[model samples]
Target: LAAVSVDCSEYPKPACTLEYRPLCGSDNKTYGNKCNFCNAVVESNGTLTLSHFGKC
Candidate 1:
């Protein structure tokens, strides 16, 4: 399948809060929470896709 690319800058910023829900991205990287992972996705411009919901 074709890799997805996103304009993170275009993605709305997530709310600021204290939450830690570990998640693994398709890029094989760990993220703090869903918001953080989403942010990371945006940051990577969709280069890093979320693989699953848990620590890598």
Candidate 2:
């Protein structure tokens, strides 16, 4: 499944806010929220998957 590769046609640079704190992922990434995390997921092409929730 190409590990669900991200589409290049999608937002070149998805916009995500940094106000609702952050979230945890494979590389200890801190996204603003779930939506922000999803944005990264696509760009990462299945490399940055969700791990857990945390603060900023």
Candidate 3:
């Protein structure tokens, strides 16, 4: 199994409506854009940590 972490912190336009719905598999944690609302401002405006592809 393998995983990849993608940085999506600076989103021109957010996707999630909440800062907890979107998940980042990288650290298996939630981050900025990955956890911010689609239209809401990022609380951290930090980098998004997204991890895709892994062993279940």
Candidate 4:
């Protein structure tokens, strides 16, 4: 799914605070927070999804 790019410019601000709610993405990558990950999904047009909670 397009390698799950995390470009800050495209996804300007992550809709999260200093919270650390880790989530594993379908791309098999570990995201430190959930908000950014969800943003990635929307940005990717459903190319990504939460595989699980916590670290990958």
On lDDT, the candidate that comes out on top is 1
Candidate 4 TM-score versus the reference: 0.65
Model 2 earns a TM-score of 0.54
Mark the 10 consecutive residues where model 3 has the least summed lDDT: 34-43
lDDT of 3 by residue, 3-45 (tens): 3433344554534454334544434554344334212223334
Ranked candidates (lDDT, high to low): 1, 4, 2, 3
Candidate with more favorable, higher lDDT: 1 or 4? 1
Q: Candidate 1 lDDT, tens digit per residue, 1-56? A: 43432234545475735687777788778877677777888777777777667788
The true-versus-predicted C-alpha distance at residue 51 of model 4, in Å, is 1.1
Question: Candidate 2, which segments miss by more than 4 Å at Cα?
Answer: 1-21
Encode model 2's per-residue lDDT on 1-56: one tens digit a residue. Answer: 25422233344355655667466666877766655666777677757775567633
lDDT of each: 0.68, 0.59, 0.38, 0.66
Per-prediction TM-score: 0.64, 0.54, 0.25, 0.65
> In candidate 4, which residue pairs clash?
none
Candidate 4 per-residue lDDT, tens place, 5-53, comes to: 3433345254577688777778877877766676777777767776677
Please give the lDDT score for candidate 2: 0.59
Off by over 4 Å in 3: 1-16, 31-49, 53-56
Q: Any idea what lDDT model 4 has?
A: 0.66
lDDT of 1: 0.68
List where candidate 4 sits over 4 angstroms from the true fold: 1-14
